[PDB]
Design a protein around this ligand. Structure first.
Ligand SMILES: NC(=O)c1ccc[n+]([C@@H]2O[C@H](COP(=O)([O-])OP(=O)(O)OC[C@H]3O[C@@H](n4cnc5c(N)ncnc54)[C@H](OP(=O)(O)O)[C@@H]3O)[C@@H](O)[C@H]2O)c1
Ligand SMILES: Nc1nc(=O)c2nc(CNc3ccc(C(=O)N[C@@H](CCC(=O)O)C(=O)O)cc3)cnc2[nH]1
Ligand SMILES: [Mn+2]
Length: 159
């Protein structure tokens, strides 16, 4: 099974200048809980944005060019990325925009954080058809001293 996980600001913005402007520790905690001990697939720009391997996960990087770091696994196509995960129950696709677009048609599950923040961005989450998805989990949180915006965790499953 292929799942996507992403944090979206208003208007589906997911990044600006290869970074995420906001800081929401609760959402990073949610990201770690849902990806730990699973393979994670990311594009090369997102790999450069994170800046180091994510521990406790098999890190698979998509790039058309040869790899430059043997702490992670480099692949050159979507089919190769899936094959490199082996026979696991759940593959996590962690972005960015171009990678989300390619894996959305294959995905059975979306883990989305909706952040109540208005951010100028240059990268967006794909425009997905709402009729294809059932919301199976929703959890809203007001802002607090550690998290400067309200946010909603949502899990969607393909109908
Ligand atoms: N809010 C969130 O949840 C979230 C999550 C992830 C990322 N982001 C943000 O997203 C932005 C980056 O997204 P992005 O769309 O610019 O880049 P990206 O999707 O992370 O990476 C694109 C690169 O990945 C390679 N690639 C993608 N598909 C490939 C394929 N089929 N075969 C071979 N290589 C492939 C290519 O690398 P080469 O050019 O080397 O060939 C391509 O240039 C950043 O701002 C990041 O902070 C946000
Ligand atoms: N919901 C969600 N939120 C995000 O911030 C997010 N970010 C990415 C890509 N960017 C990043 C950037 C940093 C870390 C990171 O440092 N994560 C640590 C958290 C450690 C902690 O919480 O202190 C990790 O171990 O997962 C992960 C992904 C992909 N999907 C996401 N999905
Ligand atoms: Mn806000």
């Amino acid at each position: 099974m292929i799942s996507l996980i992403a944090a979206l600001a208003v208007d589906r913005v997911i990044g600006m200048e290869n970074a995420m402007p906001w800081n929401l520790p609760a959402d990073l905690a949610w990201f770690k809980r849902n990806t730990l001990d699973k393979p994670v697939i990311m594009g090369r720009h997102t790999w450069e944005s994170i800046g180091r391997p994510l521990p406790g996960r098999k890190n698979i990087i998509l790039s058309s060019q040869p790899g430059t770091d043997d702490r992670v696994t480099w692949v050159k196509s979507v089919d190769e990325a899936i094959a490199a995960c082996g026979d696991v129950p759940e593959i996590m696709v962690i972005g960015g925009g171009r990678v989300y677009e390619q894996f959305l048609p294959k995905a059975q599950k979306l883990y989305l954080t909706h952040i109540d923040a208005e951010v100028e961005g240059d990268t967006h989450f794909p425009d997905y058809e709402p009729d294809d998805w059932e919301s199976v989990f929703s959890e809203f949180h007001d802002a607090d001293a550690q998290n400067s915006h309200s946010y909603c965790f949502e899990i969607l499953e393909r109908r």
